[PDB]
Amino acid sequence: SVYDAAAQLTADVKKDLRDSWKVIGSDKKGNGVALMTTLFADNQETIGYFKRLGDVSQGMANDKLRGHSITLMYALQNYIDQLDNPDDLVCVVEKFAVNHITRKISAAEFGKINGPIKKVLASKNFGDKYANAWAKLVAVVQAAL
Amino acid sequence: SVYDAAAQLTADVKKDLRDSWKVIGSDKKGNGVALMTTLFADNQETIGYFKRLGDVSQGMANDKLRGHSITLMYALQNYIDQLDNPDDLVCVVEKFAVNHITRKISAAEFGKINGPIKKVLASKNFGDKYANAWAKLVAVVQAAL
Ligand code: HEM
Ligand code: HEM
């Protein structure tokens, strides 16, 4: 269950998640856009899903993409803030899951975000230990897809 | 015009929004649900739009409503954080506007949130002065609907 996946996040994992988010979460517009552009660069097959955003090659200049990227970073902010209360983490995770279920995004496809997250983390010197911690949070969302 | 509306956010208005947000934003779950239940209680004709959340009369006990409410407070958090940059404030407002346009929500009905906000603020000892400041921020979203 999603509850089982959340309830398993350990103190060491939450610690790594919070320490790293302190940095990558400080520049939501910059890191959010880089997050999306990297996804499009390494997984071109996903581009079609974001047709509403127009030409995503525009990057920062694309106001629709910029608005989306910033808002996505707040979804991650939401997750990070609910870490110490699985009950709340679960209800928010399930809320965003619906957003993706409606767009026919599978658990496997949603996991494609791990690559970009790993690279964004790396750009700030957060290694594999930190990439692994984030894959665990993403897995909580996958449990709901 | 969303850009003209954004221009209405003067230094004094931005200050009042931040000061009051520091209090209201400290308890997103509690104040978020309070906002929603007050809306449903004072404007029962809007409950139909929230069919997906189930029985909203259950308030806090309703997982979907709680997840929705917390997330809603993060939308307001997003707005507050974009106050320094008008271009970014507009792109996020337009992003959330689409979320409501697709649900057939007009500027007029979106404005029904002013009642709940004034009441939630009043219970925290923030009067009309602060209620009006928030009305201006809400007015920015209305301009995009
Ligand atoms: C860290 C992981 C991710 C987070 C936190 C996240 C968050 C969000 C949020 C907040 C929205 C806006 C929901 C709405 O207003 O309808 C969204 C939309 C969307 N997401 Fe994700 N997402 C993530 C990963 C992904 C991945 C990997 C894919 C695709 C493989 C994906 C596909 C979509 C699509 C198609 C939309 C709709 C975009 C639009 O038309 O506006 N998401 N996501
Ligand atoms: C302070 C003002 C408000 C803010 C910041 C706000 C924010 C949000 C957010 C973030 C969502 C989730 C978007 C999504 O995932 O699709 C949402 C959904 C929604 N909002 Fe609002 N909203 C506000 C006022 C209103 C009002 C006054 C109405 C109704 C008269 C309304 C009707 C809706 C509806 C129908 C949904 C869909 C809920 C669902 O089925 O999940 N909103 N809103």
Query: Where do the structural domains in chain A lie, given as residue ranges?
Result: 1-145
Query: What number of H helices and E strands is found in chain B?
Result: 8, 0
Dmax (CA) of chain B? 41
Write down the experimental method used for this entry: X-ray
B92 touches chain A (CB under 8 A): yes
d(CA A134, CA B14): 35
Taking each helix axis from N to C terminus, what angle separates B11-24 and B63-82, rounded to the nearest 10 degrees? Answer: 150
> Can you give the C-alpha Rg of chain A in angstroms?
15
Taking each helix axis from N to C terminus, what angle separates B63-82 and B86-101, rounded to the nearest 10 degrees? Answer: 150
Residue pair B76/B27 in contact (Cβ under 8 Å)? The answer is no
CA A31 to chain centroid, in Å, comes to: 11
Which DSSP state fits A56?
Answer: G
B29 touches chain A (CB under 8 A): yes
Ligand 2 atom 38: the closest Cα is on which residue?
A: B50
Nearest CA in chain A to B53: A95
- The CATH architecture one would assign to domain B1-145 is Orthogonal Bundle (1.10)
Instruction: Supply φ then ψ for residue A127, to 5 degrees.
Output: -75, -165
